[PDB]
PDB file of all heavy atoms in Angstrom:
ATOM      1  N   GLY M  27       0.812  -1.199  -0.059  1.00  0.00           N
ATOM      2  CA  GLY M  27      -0.015  -0.027   0.075  1.00  0.00           C
ATOM      3  C   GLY M  27       0.872   1.292   0.061  1.00  0.00           C
ATOM      4  O   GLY M  27       0.532   2.199  -0.669  1.00  0.00           O
ATOM      5  N   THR M  28       1.955   1.300   0.781  1.00  0.00           N
ATOM      6  CA  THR M  28       2.776   2.502   0.831  1.00  0.00           C
ATOM      7  C   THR M  28       3.682   2.505  -0.380  1.00  0.00           C
ATOM      8  O   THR M  28       3.805   3.573  -1.013  1.00  0.00           O
ATOM      9  CB  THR M  28       3.830   2.342   2.099  1.00  0.00           C
ATOM     10  OG1 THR M  28       3.076   2.389   3.275  1.00  0.00           O
ATOM     11  CG2 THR M  28       4.775   3.532   2.051  1.00  0.00           C
ATOM     12  N   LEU M  29       4.091   1.396  -0.873  1.00  0.00           N
ATOM     13  CA  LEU M  29       4.934   1.438  -2.166  1.00  0.00           C
ATOM     14  C   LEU M  29       4.153   1.903  -3.299  1.00  0.00           C
ATOM     15  O   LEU M  29       4.700   2.843  -3.947  1.00  0.00           O
ATOM     16  CB  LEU M  29       5.400  -0.034  -2.422  1.00  0.00           C
ATOM     17  CG  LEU M  29       6.369  -0.297  -3.728  1.00  0.00           C
ATOM     18  CD1 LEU M  29       7.521   0.576  -3.646  1.00  0.00           C
ATOM     19  CD2 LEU M  29       6.364  -1.673  -3.899  1.00  0.00           C
ATOM     20  N   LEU M  30       2.887   1.608  -3.446  1.00  0.00           N
ATOM     21  CA  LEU M  30       2.131   2.059  -4.480  1.00  0.00           C
ATOM     22  C   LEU M  30       1.820   3.506  -4.337  1.00  0.00           C
ATOM     23  O   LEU M  30       1.746   4.331  -5.224  1.00  0.00           O
ATOM     24  CB  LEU M  30       0.789   1.244  -4.678  1.00  0.00           C
ATOM     25  CG  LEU M  30       1.022  -0.049  -5.637  1.00  0.00           C
ATOM     26  CD1 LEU M  30       1.909  -1.023  -4.928  1.00  0.00           C
ATOM     27  CD2 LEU M  30      -0.378  -0.737  -5.911  1.00  0.00           C
ATOM     28  N   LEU M  31       1.512   3.883  -3.104  1.00  0.00           N
ATOM     29  CA  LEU M  31       1.318   5.293  -2.760  1.00  0.00           C
ATOM     30  C   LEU M  31       2.474   6.191  -3.250  1.00  0.00           C
ATOM     31  O   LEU M  31       2.378   7.248  -3.756  1.00  0.00           O
ATOM     32  CB  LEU M  31       1.008   5.447  -1.286  1.00  0.00           C
ATOM     33  CG  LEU M  31       0.735   6.983  -0.884  1.00  0.00           C
ATOM     34  CD1 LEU M  31      -0.413   7.427  -1.774  1.00  0.00           C
ATOM     35  CD2 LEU M  31       0.561   7.165   0.493  1.00  0.00           C
ATOM     36  N   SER M  32       3.693   5.666  -2.802  1.00  0.00           N
ATOM     37  CA  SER M  32       4.975   6.360  -3.034  1.00  0.00           C
ATOM     38  C   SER M  32       5.214   6.667  -4.537  1.00  0.00           C
ATOM     39  O   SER M  32       5.496   7.780  -4.895  1.00  0.00           O
ATOM     40  CB  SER M  32       6.083   5.728  -2.410  1.00  0.00           C
ATOM     41  OG  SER M  32       6.340   4.509  -3.059  1.00  0.00           O
ATOM     42  N   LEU M  33       5.044   5.657  -5.313  1.00  0.00           N
ATOM     43  CA  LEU M  33       5.296   5.719  -6.877  1.00  0.00           C
ATOM     44  C   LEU M  33       4.429   6.822  -7.446  1.00  0.00           C
ATOM     45  O   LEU M  33       4.880   7.472  -8.258  1.00  0.00           O
ATOM     46  CB  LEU M  33       5.113   4.324  -7.493  1.00  0.00           C
ATOM     47  CG  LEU M  33       6.129   3.412  -6.792  1.00  0.00           C
ATOM     48  CD1 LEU M  33       6.591   2.271  -7.689  1.00  0.00           C
ATOM     49  CD2 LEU M  33       7.385   4.213  -6.247  1.00  0.00           C
ATOM     50  N   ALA M  34       3.146   6.912  -7.115  1.00  0.00           N
ATOM     51  CA  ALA M  34       2.237   7.875  -7.641  1.00  0.00           C
ATOM     52  C   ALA M  34       2.877   9.300  -7.283  1.00  0.00           C
ATOM     53  O   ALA M  34       2.799  10.097  -8.092  1.00  0.00           O
ATOM     54  CB  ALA M  34       0.902   7.698  -7.129  1.00  0.00           C
ATOM     55  N   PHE M  35       3.338   9.456  -6.119  1.00  0.00           N
ATOM     56  CA  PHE M  35       3.877  10.678  -5.709  1.00  0.00           C
ATOM     57  C   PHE M  35       5.192  11.022  -6.512  1.00  0.00           C
ATOM     58  O   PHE M  35       5.324  12.089  -6.928  1.00  0.00           O
ATOM     59  CB  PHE M  35       4.146  10.696  -4.217  1.00  0.00           C
ATOM     60  CG  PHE M  35       3.175  11.494  -3.356  1.00  0.00           C
ATOM     61  CD1 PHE M  35       2.200  10.733  -2.623  1.00  0.00           C
ATOM     62  CD2 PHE M  35       3.014  12.731  -3.414  1.00  0.00           C
ATOM     63  CE1 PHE M  35       1.337  11.381  -1.936  1.00  0.00           C
ATOM     64  CE2 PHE M  35       2.117  13.431  -2.705  1.00  0.00           C
ATOM     65  CZ  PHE M  35       1.204  12.735  -2.000  1.00  0.00           C
ATOM     66  N   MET M  36       5.964   9.886  -6.728  1.00  0.00           N
ATOM     67  CA  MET M  36       7.161  10.099  -7.640  1.00  0.00           C
ATOM     68  C   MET M  36       6.784  10.146  -9.063  1.00  0.00           C
ATOM     69  O   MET M  36       7.416  10.854  -9.747  1.00  0.00           O
ATOM     70  CB  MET M  36       8.102   8.887  -7.286  1.00  0.00           C
ATOM     71  CG  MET M  36       9.162   9.190  -6.214  1.00  0.00           C
ATOM     72  SD  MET M  36      10.285   7.634  -6.166  1.00  0.00           S
ATOM     73  CE  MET M  36       9.138   6.655  -5.234  1.00  0.00           C
ATOM     74  N   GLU M  37       5.785   9.414  -9.402  1.00  0.00           N
ATOM     75  CA  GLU M  37       5.408   9.258 -10.804  1.00  0.00           C
ATOM     76  C   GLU M  37       4.976  10.617 -11.366  1.00  0.00           C
ATOM     77  O   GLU M  37       5.172  10.875 -12.549  1.00  0.00           O
ATOM     78  CB  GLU M  37       4.295   8.287 -11.002  1.00  0.00           C
ATOM     79  CG  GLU M  37       3.952   8.140 -12.464  1.00  0.00           C
ATOM     80  CD  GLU M  37       5.047   7.503 -13.367  1.00  0.00           C
ATOM     81  OE1 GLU M  37       6.031   7.056 -12.684  1.00  0.00           O
ATOM     82  OE2 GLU M  37       4.982   7.584 -14.544  1.00  0.00           O
ATOM     83  N   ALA M  38       4.317  11.391 -10.525  1.00  0.00           N
ATOM     84  CA  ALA M  38       3.764  12.724 -11.044  1.00  0.00           C
ATOM     85  C   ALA M  38       5.002  13.486 -11.448  1.00  0.00           C
ATOM     86  O   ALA M  38       4.908  14.148 -12.501  1.00  0.00           O
ATOM     87  CB  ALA M  38       2.957  13.328 -10.017  1.00  0.00           C
ATOM     88  N   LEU M  39       6.008  13.601 -10.670  1.00  0.00           N
ATOM     89  CA  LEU M  39       7.145  14.444 -10.949  1.00  0.00           C
ATOM     90  C   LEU M  39       7.419  14.507 -12.475  1.00  0.00           C
ATOM     91  O   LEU M  39       7.815  15.548 -13.034  1.00  0.00           O
ATOM     92  CB  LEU M  39       8.380  14.028 -10.160  1.00  0.00           C
ATOM     93  CG  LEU M  39       8.219  14.211  -8.681  1.00  0.00           C
ATOM     94  CD1 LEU M  39       9.440  13.868  -7.891  1.00  0.00           C
ATOM     95  CD2 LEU M  39       7.587  15.522  -8.219  1.00  0.00           C
ATOM     96  N   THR M  40       7.389  13.335 -13.166  1.00  0.00           N
ATOM     97  CA  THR M  40       7.614  13.275 -14.485  1.00  0.00           C
ATOM     98  C   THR M  40       6.505  13.562 -15.390  1.00  0.00           C
ATOM     99  O   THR M  40       6.576  13.883 -16.551  1.00  0.00           O
ATOM    100  CB  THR M  40       8.130  11.829 -14.910  1.00  0.00           C
ATOM    101  OG1 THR M  40       9.367  11.492 -14.216  1.00  0.00           O
ATOM    102  CG2 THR M  40       8.505  11.705 -16.447  1.00  0.00           C
ATOM    103  N   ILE M  41       5.315  13.655 -14.645  1.00  0.00           N
ATOM    104  CA  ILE M  41       3.963  14.010 -15.301  1.00  0.00           C
ATOM    105  C   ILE M  41       4.142  15.535 -15.645  1.00  0.00           C
ATOM    106  O   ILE M  41       3.491  15.890 -16.660  1.00  0.00           O
ATOM    107  CB  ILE M  41       2.801  13.680 -14.592  1.00  0.00           C
ATOM    108  CG1 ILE M  41       1.476  13.725 -15.330  1.00  0.00           C
ATOM    109  CG2 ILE M  41       2.660  14.449 -13.244  1.00  0.00           C
ATOM    110  CD1 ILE M  41       1.454  12.825 -16.542  1.00  0.00           C
ATOM    111  N   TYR M  42       4.727  16.259 -14.723  1.00  0.00           N
ATOM    112  CA  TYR M  42       4.737  17.695 -14.964  1.00  0.00           C
ATOM    113  C   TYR M  42       5.542  18.046 -16.140  1.00  0.00           C
ATOM    114  O   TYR M  42       5.288  19.053 -16.953  1.00  0.00           O
ATOM    115  CB  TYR M  42       5.257  18.392 -13.629  1.00  0.00           C
ATOM    116  CG  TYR M  42       4.466  18.200 -12.400  1.00  0.00           C
ATOM    117  CD1 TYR M  42       4.995  18.238 -11.137  1.00  0.00           C
ATOM    118  CD2 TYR M  42       3.214  17.801 -12.533  1.00  0.00           C
ATOM    119  CE1 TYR M  42       4.347  18.095 -10.051  1.00  0.00           C
ATOM    120  CE2 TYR M  42       2.382  17.530 -11.176  1.00  0.00           C
ATOM    121  CZ  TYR M  42       3.075  17.634 -10.058  1.00  0.00           C
ATOM    122  OH  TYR M  42       2.475  17.315  -8.877  1.00  0.00           O
ATOM    123  N   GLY M  43       6.685  17.229 -16.334  1.00  0.00           N
ATOM    124  CA  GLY M  43       7.632  17.423 -17.341  1.00  0.00           C
ATOM    125  C   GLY M  43       6.910  16.864 -18.673  1.00  0.00           C
ATOM    126  O   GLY M  43       7.262  17.297 -19.849  1.00  0.00           O
ATOM    127  N   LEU M  44       5.992  15.986 -18.605  1.00  0.00           N
ATOM    128  CA  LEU M  44       5.326  15.386 -19.791  1.00  0.00           C
ATOM    129  C   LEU M  44       4.237  16.371 -20.084  1.00  0.00           C
ATOM    130  O   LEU M  44       3.975  16.623 -21.369  1.00  0.00           O
ATOM    131  CB  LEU M  44       4.642  14.073 -19.340  1.00  0.00           C
ATOM    132  CG  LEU M  44       3.790  13.326 -20.364  1.00  0.00           C
ATOM    133  CD1 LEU M  44       4.670  12.938 -21.633  1.00  0.00           C
ATOM    134  CD2 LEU M  44       3.222  12.054 -19.690  1.00  0.00           C
ATOM    135  N   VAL M  45       3.450  16.954 -19.260  1.00  0.00           N
ATOM    136  CA  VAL M  45       2.330  17.932 -19.617  1.00  0.00           C
ATOM    137  C   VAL M  45       2.864  19.150 -20.196  1.00  0.00           C
ATOM    138  O   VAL M  45       2.350  19.563 -21.271  1.00  0.00           O
ATOM    139  CB  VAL M  45       1.596  18.135 -18.282  1.00  0.00           C
ATOM    140  CG1 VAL M  45       0.867  19.530 -18.391  1.00  0.00           C
ATOM    141  CG2 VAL M  45       0.592  17.050 -17.965  1.00  0.00           C
ATOM    142  N   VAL M  46       3.982  19.710 -19.590  1.00  0.00           N
ATOM    143  CA  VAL M  46       4.491  20.941 -20.260  1.00  0.00           C
ATOM    144  C   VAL M  46       5.068  20.673 -21.513  1.00  0.00           C
ATOM    145  O   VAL M  46       5.102  21.489 -22.484  1.00  0.00           O
ATOM    146  CB  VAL M  46       5.588  21.499 -19.209  1.00  0.00           C
ATOM    147  CG1 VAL M  46       6.419  22.568 -19.957  1.00  0.00           C
ATOM    148  CG2 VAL M  46       4.933  22.235 -18.089  1.00  0.00           C
ATOM    149  N   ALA M  47       5.677  19.434 -21.628  1.00  0.00           N
ATOM    150  CA  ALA M  47       6.068  19.052 -23.097  1.00  0.00           C
ATOM    151  C   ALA M  47       5.045  18.986 -24.096  1.00  0.00           C
ATOM    152  O   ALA M  47       5.224  19.401 -25.236  1.00  0.00           O
ATOM    153  CB  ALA M  47       6.843  17.714 -23.016  1.00  0.00           C
ATOM    154  N   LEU M  48       3.904  18.561 -23.657  1.00  0.00           N
ATOM    155  CA  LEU M  48       2.714  18.544 -24.651  1.00  0.00           C
ATOM    156  C   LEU M  48       2.114  19.878 -24.810  1.00  0.00           C
ATOM    157  O   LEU M  48       1.714  20.244 -25.867  1.00  0.00           O
ATOM    158  CB  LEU M  48       1.690  17.498 -24.076  1.00  0.00           C
ATOM    159  CG  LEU M  48       2.240  16.059 -23.986  1.00  0.00           C
ATOM    160  CD1 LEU M  48       0.942  15.213 -23.692  1.00  0.00           C
ATOM    161  CD2 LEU M  48       2.821  15.605 -25.240  1.00  0.00           C
ATOM    162  N   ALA M  49       2.122  20.674 -23.739  1.00  0.00           N
ATOM    163  CA  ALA M  49       1.569  22.010 -23.835  1.00  0.00           C
ATOM    164  C   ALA M  49       2.534  22.841 -24.711  1.00  0.00           C
ATOM    165  O   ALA M  49       2.117  23.838 -25.274  1.00  0.00           O
ATOM    166  CB  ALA M  49       1.394  22.663 -22.462  1.00  0.00           C
ATOM    167  N   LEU M  50       3.757  22.426 -24.859  1.00  0.00           N
ATOM    168  CA  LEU M  50       4.717  23.045 -25.719  1.00  0.00           C
ATOM    169  C   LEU M  50       4.444  22.504 -27.224  1.00  0.00           C
ATOM    170  O   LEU M  50       4.577  23.304 -28.186  1.00  0.00           O
ATOM    171  CB  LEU M  50       6.120  22.616 -25.299  1.00  0.00           C
ATOM    172  CG  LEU M  50       6.660  23.498 -24.211  1.00  0.00           C
ATOM    173  CD1 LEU M  50       7.957  23.066 -23.651  1.00  0.00           C
ATOM    174  CD2 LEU M  50       6.786  24.981 -24.615  1.00  0.00           C
ATOM    175  N   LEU M  51       4.246  21.240 -27.356  1.00  0.00           N
ATOM    176  CA  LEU M  51       3.967  20.698 -28.667  1.00  0.00           C
ATOM    177  C   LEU M  51       2.647  20.931 -29.284  1.00  0.00           C
ATOM    178  O   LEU M  51       2.560  21.296 -30.490  1.00  0.00           O
ATOM    179  CB  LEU M  51       4.261  19.224 -28.721  1.00  0.00           C
ATOM    180  CG  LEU M  51       5.734  18.685 -28.404  1.00  0.00           C
ATOM    181  CD1 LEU M  51       5.886  17.270 -28.321  1.00  0.00           C
ATOM    182  CD2 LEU M  51       6.725  19.345 -29.345  1.00  0.00           C
ATOM    183  N   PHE M  52       1.653  20.753 -28.514  1.00  0.00           N
ATOM    184  CA  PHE M  52       0.274  20.719 -29.034  1.00  0.00           C
ATOM    185  C   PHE M  52      -0.455  22.127 -28.647  1.00  0.00           C
ATOM    186  O   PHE M  52      -0.778  22.800 -29.598  1.00  0.00           O
ATOM    187  CB  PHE M  52      -0.537  19.601 -28.638  1.00  0.00           C
ATOM    188  CG  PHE M  52      -0.177  18.371 -29.382  1.00  0.00           C
ATOM    189  CD1 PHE M  52      -0.799  17.080 -29.021  1.00  0.00           C
ATOM    190  CD2 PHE M  52       0.672  18.336 -30.422  1.00  0.00           C
ATOM    191  CE1 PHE M  52      -0.557  15.891 -29.699  1.00  0.00           C
ATOM    192  CE2 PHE M  52       1.063  17.166 -31.083  1.00  0.00           C
ATOM    193  CZ  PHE M  52       0.462  15.966 -30.669  1.00  0.00           C
ATOM    194  N   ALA M  53      -0.681  22.358 -27.392  1.00  0.00           N
ATOM    195  CA  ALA M  53      -1.426  23.537 -27.113  1.00  0.00           C
ATOM    196  C   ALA M  53      -0.481  24.713 -26.904  1.00  0.00           C
ATOM    197  O   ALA M  53      -0.731  25.458 -25.819  1.00  0.00           O
ATOM    198  CB  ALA M  53      -2.257  23.288 -25.973  1.00  0.00           C
ATOM    199  N   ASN M  54       0.183  25.093 -27.891  1.00  0.00           N
ATOM    200  CA  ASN M  54       1.307  25.985 -27.672  1.00  0.00           C
ATOM    201  C   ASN M  54       0.595  27.446 -28.031  1.00  0.00           C
ATOM    202  O   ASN M  54       0.171  27.598 -29.063  1.00  0.00           O
ATOM    203  CB  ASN M  54       2.473  25.858 -28.630  1.00  0.00           C
ATOM    204  CG  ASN M  54       3.611  26.713 -28.440  1.00  0.00           C
ATOM    205  OD1 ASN M  54       3.412  27.887 -28.059  1.00  0.00           O
ATOM    206  ND2 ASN M  54       4.780  26.384 -28.892  1.00  0.00           N
ATOM    207  N   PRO M  55       0.599  28.267 -26.936  1.00  0.00           N
ATOM    208  CA  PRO M  55       0.037  29.602 -26.982  1.00  0.00           C
ATOM    209  C   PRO M  55       0.930  30.582 -27.950  1.00  0.00           C
ATOM    210  O   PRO M  55       0.449  31.445 -28.479  1.00  0.00           O
ATOM    211  CB  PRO M  55       0.021  30.075 -25.651  1.00  0.00           C
ATOM    212  CG  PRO M  55       1.120  29.447 -24.992  1.00  0.00           C
ATOM    213  CD  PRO M  55       1.126  28.013 -25.563  1.00  0.00           C
TER     214      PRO M  55
END
């Protein structure tokens, strides 16, 4: 339960870099 909880907290960190990468590629203002 803790291990899975931790990875989500860690996993997001790369999500922010993924989201900004897409906001750069696709919805680029």
Side-chain angles (χ1 to χ4, degrees):
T28 299
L29 177 63
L30 275 66
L31 177 63
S32 64
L33 302 206
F35 263 101
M36 264 180 285
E37 183 65 13
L39 298 183
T40 299
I41 191 66
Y42 304 156
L44 177 63
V45 157
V46 167
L48 296 189
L50 281 170
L51 295 174
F52 286 174
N54 180 335

